[PDB]
Swiss-Prot record:
Native source organism of the sequence: Homo sapiens
Annotated disulfide bonds: none
PTM remark: Auto-ADP-ribosylated.
Species lineage: Eukaryota, Metazoa, Chordata, Craniata, Vertebrata
Inducing stimuli: Up-regulated by IFNG in macrophages. Down-regulated by IL4 in macrophages.
Protein name per Swiss-Prot or TrEMBL: Protein mono-ADP-ribosyltransferase PARP14
Family indicated by similarity: Belongs to the ARTD/PARP family.
Length: 375
């Protein structure tokens, strides 16, 4: 039983249907999974059954070679006896009344990530169930608006290249599908304040011209500052004494992934510069998403321990490391929120976002997200 049919964009159509994810006319289906890729209850169990042990087997090996996933994550496995080659496994969040927005955030990261994945393997049709709604507790109303919002933003934010044409939104119960069809109906000043007081300023200057107490740079494993365009602009403006200081502070240290080192500002108008070695997008890896949230937390954390009052973040990793810009905007914003609410800060009160005037995708990404957050 089909319900509605909606156009997103030329060639692309969103279809709410009733049906069984096991037997559907699409390239790939999305599984509501957990952190271990274990499929012991729910639909994922329905899927495992039909697929046979092959389905679990690959998962098990995926979990032993890449390790457990975390909420807000998605990977891709063999399908076994299913009418597909692959299943996309989306690990949605567990639902908590207190951490609502972070839950909304992670449910949506999962959906976004799973669209990325299907797009990577060039699929042109996908089936998505109401992830999280079952045994992870996510109230059916918010769950499905979030999924639909996620999908909208996928085609709204960058039209530039897309393999997907058919997105099915599925379930076997009639009410979940009613939700979905209601959800689709509903779905179709750069300055926020978190609960605990700290505010985030959208700012459209070169990072070199920033005037905060702390500024973050993104830099490679051997710490040369001349390579990336962000690093280059700081190097140029500060003086070469920043390269000399950085190489000397990172002397006795086996520079790894998620490494943060502090230097003084020289020519620059800030007091200190935090230099950070950000992870490659690696296709949206679990690691990449941890390590980056961690850097973000550490730089704010450090800053509170220096008793400083303000810090300037650029779109780190959205250049050569290949982070889809929207995903990042929304990664760092969540993290500033999550962090501010959970701590009682004494001196940190202002996170600025420095976006090059000529970087419209980054200006765009952060605006849209700021708009949602003020909405
Ligand atoms: N002057 C500026 N002011 C503000 N933003 C800027 C500026 N210049 C560039 N951006 C934005 O800055 C963003 C980041 O661009 P990238 O410099 O590649 O850093 P990355 O974090 O992607 O990683 C690449 C580096 O790290 C790796 O180890 C590589 O070896 C490189 O050294 C882009 O969105 C720019 O639009």
């Amino acid at each position: 039983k089909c319900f509605s049919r909606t156009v997103l964009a030329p060639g692309v159509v969103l279809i709410v249907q009733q049906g069984d994810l096991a037997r559907l006319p699409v390239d790939v289906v999305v599984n509501a999974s957990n952190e271990d890729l274990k499929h012991y209850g729910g639909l994922a169990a329905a899927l495992s059954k039909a697929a046979g042990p092959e389905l679990q087997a690959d998962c098990d090996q995926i979990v032993k070679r890449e390790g457990r996933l975390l909420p807000g994550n998605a990977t891709i496995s063999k399908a076994g006896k299913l009418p597909y080659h692959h299943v996309i496994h989306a690990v949605g969040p567990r639902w908590s009344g207190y951490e609502a927005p972070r839950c909304v955030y992670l449910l949506r990261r999962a959906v976004q990530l799973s669209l990325c994945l299907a797009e990577k393997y060039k699929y042109r049709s996908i089936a998505i169930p109401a992830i999280s709604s079952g045994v992870f507790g996510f109230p059916l109303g918010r769950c499905v608006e979030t999924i639909v919002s996620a999908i909208k933003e996928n085609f709204q934010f960058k039209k530039d290249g897309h393999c997907l044409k058919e997105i099915y939104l599925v379930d076997v119960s009639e009410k979940t599908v009613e939700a979905f069809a209601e959800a689709v109906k509903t779905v179709f000043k750069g300055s926020l304040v978190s609960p605990g007081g700290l505010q985030m300023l959208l700012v459209k200057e070169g990072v070199q011209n920033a005037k905060t107490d702390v500024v973050v740079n993104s830099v490679p494993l051997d710490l040369v500052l001349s390579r990336g365009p962000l690093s280059k602009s700081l190097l140029e403006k500060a003086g070469p004494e920043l390269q000399e200081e950085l190489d000397t502070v990172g002397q006795g240290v086996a520079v790894s992934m998620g490494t943060v080192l502090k230097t003084s500002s020289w020519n620059l108008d800030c007091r200190y510069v935090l230099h950070v070695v950000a992870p490659e997008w690696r296709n949206g890896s679990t690691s990449s998403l941890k390590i980056m949230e961690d850097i973000i937390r550490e730089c704010m954390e450090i800053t509170e321990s220096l008793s400083l009052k303000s810090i300037a973040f650029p779109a780190i990793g959205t250049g050569n490391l290949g982070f889809p810009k929207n995903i990042f905007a929304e990664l760092i914003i969540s993290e500033v929120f999550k962090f501010s609410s959970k701590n009682q800060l004494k001196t940190l009160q202002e996170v600025h976002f420095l976006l090059h005037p000529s970087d419209h995708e980054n200006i765009q990404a952060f605006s849209d997200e700021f708009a949602r957050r003020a909405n």
